[PDB]
Every structure is written in structure tokens, then in C-alpha cells.
Design a protein around this ligand. Structure first.
Ligand SMILES: [Ca+2]
Length: 138
DNA sequence: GGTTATGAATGAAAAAGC
DNA sequence: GCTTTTTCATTCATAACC
């Protein structure tokens, strides 16, 4: 039972609305529920979204007040050309199967470009990075 | 300056072993 | 088929890395 990491705005939103999403989608597993929670979080307006950011701020403040000494712990030329190519392909994946493509369509996308994405975690990260970057500019 | 990797909560699905 | 352990989907914050 070490000192945990404080919840962000989304993890607070997930803690509250996860049981409601599972009620409205009972034949879809928890990993798919996480895809729905993220879809709802993007759908919120600045009014309701700021409510959870303000709630996440107080959690961080109380966390430092309770744990004052806690610390947050954890080809070169063709590298940028590769990264730009990876983001462009994930852009096509979203416009072809939605921003939260099914695990099947995501797996088939990985195999179609198995050379560009040498692993599943490399593709999933790029799916999350590109999607989150589009939503901040909306 | 830009990118990668991590851990926060939660829980069905999978793996392990029986 | 059961119980217990391990996977992993999600955004955000962010240190570690390049
Ligand atoms: Ca078995």
C-alpha cells in the first residue's frame, strides 16, 4: 500500500460514470466501456468538463498537503518521417472506423501496416496520442 | 523542443492451475 | 467449472528519454 498517484479529471469522470455506461451497454466488456467513457468525456461541454478539472485540482492540492515529500516517479533522419507516417495512417483509421475503432478493425489495421507498427503497444499509443491531440483542438 | 513511457480506477476477459 | 492472478481499454499529467 504505497502512496498512490492522484486522479486526473478523467479518472474522476470514469469513477462516476463507469457503472452507468455498463448499465446502458451490458453486452460490452469493461475495456469497451473505457472506450465509451472517453467518447463521453470528449462530448462534454466546457461547462461540465471544467467541473471535473476543478475537482481534480482539489485532489492534487489535498494530495500534496497530505504527502508533502512525495515525488512523481516512474535511422535518425527517417525517424521524423516515420512518426509523421504513423500519425497519417492512424488518421485514416479514424476516418474509416471511427475514433474508437473495434479491436478487430484495430488488429486488422496493424497487420495491414505491420512494417510501420512493429508491435501492438506502438499502435495503441499512436491511437491514443493522435486521438487526444485532435480532441484538444476542438 | 519533441517523443516515449508510466500510473493513476475500474472490471470483464484472459491466463494459470487446479 | 472454480478461484486467483494478470491483461488492458480509456485521458491526463509528466518525468524520463531522444
Ligand atoms: Ca485451462
Amino acid at each position: 500500500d504505497h502512496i498512490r498517484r492522484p486522479m486526473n479529471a478523467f479518472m474522476i469522470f470514469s469513477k462516476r460514470h463507469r457503472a452507468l455506461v455498463h448499465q446502458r451497454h451490458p453486452n460490452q466488456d469493461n475495456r469497451t466501456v473505457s472506450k465509451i467513457l472517453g467518447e463521453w468525456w470528449y462530448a462534454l461541454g466546457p461547462k461540465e468538463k471544467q467541473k471535473y478539472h476543478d475537482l481534480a485540482f482539489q485532489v492534487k492540492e489535498a494530495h500534496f498537503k497530505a504527502h508533502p515529500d512525495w515525488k512523481w516517479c516512474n535511422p535518425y533522419s527517417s525517424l521524423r518521417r516515420t512518426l509523421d507516417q504513423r500519425r497519417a495512417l492512424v488518421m485514416q483509421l479514424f476516418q474509416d472506423h471511427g475514433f474508437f475503432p473495434s479491436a478487430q478493425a484495430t488488429a486488422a489495421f496493424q497487420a495491414r501496416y505491420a512494417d510501420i507498427f512493429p508491435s501492438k503497444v506502438c499502435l495503441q499509443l499512436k491511437i491514443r496520442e493522435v486521438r487526444q491531440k485532435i480532441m484538444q483542438a476542438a
